[model samples]
Target: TDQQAEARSYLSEEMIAEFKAAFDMFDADGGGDISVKELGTVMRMLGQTPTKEELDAIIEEVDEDGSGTIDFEEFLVMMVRQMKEDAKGKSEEELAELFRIFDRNADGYIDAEELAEIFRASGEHVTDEEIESLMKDGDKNNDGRIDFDEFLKMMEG
Candidate 1:
């Protein structure tokens, strides 16, 4: 029900396990969060001798809410963002999986109804105007639905 849970909706279970392992590596002392000091040590292990200023800056930069520590949710979201670059790192397989997630009817396309349904299931109160906006961008053929190619372009943007 939070940033931590958001990854489970899209990422595979194996990937989540990998993320947990990586998080635990940084979360020394079993605190469930990575402090600046722990992160610094990890960086040094990776052969980068980060200064104290740099270490604190990393916490301030990526750790939102001024917590001075990186929570699992923050770490997960950061890793996902790095992997999900716009059209660069994403493969056809990943896009297909994402498309299938929204194309729940197994109809090989995403319609406005299914789009709204997916958003609703995510606990979002999606309005018609918002859905229409997405359709306008992705429904290039104007057939009232999004084919795989249009979906790809929408994601590439």
Candidate 2:
């Protein structure tokens, strides 16, 4: 009854590299991590802002080590776990449709810029500071951006 775990689905190196680039782009100050302020900006860009409880919920979910913040590895690990859970019973088509919403450019790849733009288009105005914080919190590679892999992971969450 083992299904081979779907080949241990994970982000590829190329995907991770691109994700890092986007992450770095958002972490404008080169800070090692993100803060609530930064998260606010990112949320604004997406045309939304997390209420205190909402933000706290996200922090609690990703801050796996309970260190009060999410590091890159912890973020990635959380992402993978979430994605696996999400994939449990969805059809491939359903998954694709779900992902399409985030892949703003439709290039089959989701990047930080694309994510920001999506938020903007949706009436969110994520501030640079918020973007920085979100990148720090979610960008596992600390490279400045998020890619499809990261997006997928996030959606899983």
Candidate 3:
């Protein structure tokens, strides 16, 4: 295992495999990375379609090195954090505004169904188990839901 990649991404071995599966699906060049263009193509191919806001967040969250392409490590960042490096710069109001979008049901929390919606829109074929895993990813309270506070921390912490 590459020590640098492991330090940079907290994903488990199984999560890495899951990410690899999706990355391979859209890595058109088989170059072991997905450029912004290919990522867009994958979303289009799935016919799920992301709004500009959703798409931007996905790319910016993982492309933390400001690279135009997303490698396995970067993809891992999105699975775990879904945040940009400058997340701390955003005000609480701003983070809350962003959180509202993910909280699709608007119950002041991001639930599994809402999160799965975003994943499917991004062209990731998520299983029920995967959805549950996501909820458990940064869940501090074990409520199976990400409240605004957790969402904020998950975003940039």
Candidate 4:
């Protein structure tokens, strides 16, 4: 029993690290808990527009204490299953995290600098022309910034 516990202990340690990284990336406000809104924001950033039902299901899986939010341990368990059985979903979630990083200002909108930074950060040095094109295509409201709706239309729609 002691040996069995040790093996699982190492496994748990690594899993904890992985979950912490995920939680930190998703915790935009640094509230130290995973909420439904944060989860939905990540899904949306990843170019995956989850419906309300899917969002609710996500909360059910991760919010084990049912505080309407998830602690690190619950997120750890949730991501362990996610990594094992849903590789594609995991990557999509990672992409969503990356998009959040690209947003830069956390203003719930993307500007040219944000778009260009994303490309550059990913090792793709896009030109100013390309940035303009992205803005032109996505800035449907002509507000000089691409909101979530505009970005979703361009990327997912």
Candidate 5:
């Protein structure tokens, strides 16, 4: 029931209902709790190939009472946490792809010239002075180039 309050904080009622429907599919035995093994099977079918130890670790976190099974609230809260995490995860992956685009020469970094070139390609005619200032803000390490991590911070902002 505590999970009800916590779940409401991050999940809408509709999402919670969706989770219940999916949970019912996993609780194949109609016992109100799904076995960790069945959870692993479903996970693999969904394209995740987690090891038994991985499933054990997940159960360790989600099976609050060490019940070795995932109940509705437990599964619900786990999905809530996962939904939050996956949102960030996808953005981080997207950031990586964007970084690759900005690192135009394939040298694994974005220099002022490369960035300026991209800007110029947009036909805005970005001045050298403006490019330098942009570099000053993004090239945090004073190395005159933006690595993936620095680019990530800049893009996230």
Candidate 6:
């Protein structure tokens, strides 16, 4: 369906890369899934350490299998839902601004490295450990890098 395709096109390459990196960082253990604890790590790196209650709320909203963890598929669904919600209240200018911030490379797209750079520039310091962790998590296709599809799935969360 063009639904997914359209949604994918709405995102820049940099955004996709950044999303993948964040997803990978949260999916510790190389398990192709992310638990609350692992997600917390990414949150911390983003400089927003979530409270337990907040974490619980997020998990409850996104986790579909009752497995207390969010798999890649579940994450992607969540992102699409959020994108729809975001579109509803956002003005065109607001949406463009949002895209600008995420598209760190200025290449009309966003990648994981660019995403991390944005966080850092925004006063959040992503450690080397965090970057290493992300590399492990989002590279599910084992391509040693994450592309737009994988990144979009992570953004769903």
What lDDT tens digits, residue by residue, belong to model 4 across residues 1-157? 2433432354567666765797899988898887778889999999999987888798777565678776666666565565556876765676567557768999988889888887888899789998999899989988889877676677762
Q: Which stretches of candidate 4 lie over 4 Å from their true place?
A: 1-12, 86-157
Q: Name every residue pair that clashes in candidate 5.
A: none
lDDT of 2 by residue, 23-130 (tens): 555454667554555556677788996886776676677665566654555445555666677777465556577668867667765556766777898899898787
lDDT of 3 by residue, 54-156 (tens): 6666777667667667777777665555434445445666887777777887888888888889778879889998878767775779988999778877777
Best by TM-score: 5
The 0-to-1 C-alpha lDDT of every candidate, in the order given, reads 0.84, 0.62, 0.74, 0.75, 0.85, 0.69
Which residue segments of model 3 deviate by more than 4 Å? 1-10, 50-57, 82-157
Model 6 over residues 28-116: C-alpha lDDT tens digits? 89888888888788788889979977887887776766888877656655676788787766644555575578766666545567667
Q: By lDDT, is 3 or 6 better?
A: 3
What lDDT score is found at residue 17 in candidate 4? 74
Better-scoring candidate (lDDT), 2 or 4: 4
Per-model TM values vs. the true structure: 0.49, 0.44, 0.41, 0.45, 0.72, 0.45
Looking at model 4, report the run of 10 residues with the lowest lDDT sum. 1-10
Those runs of model 5 whose alpha carbons end farther than 4 Å from true positions after fitting are: 1-4, 40-57, 120-133, 141-143
Query: Better model by lDDT, 1 or 3?
Result: 1
Give residue 62's lDDT in candidate 5 (0 to 100). Answer: 76
Candidate 1 lowest-lDDT run of ten: 1-10
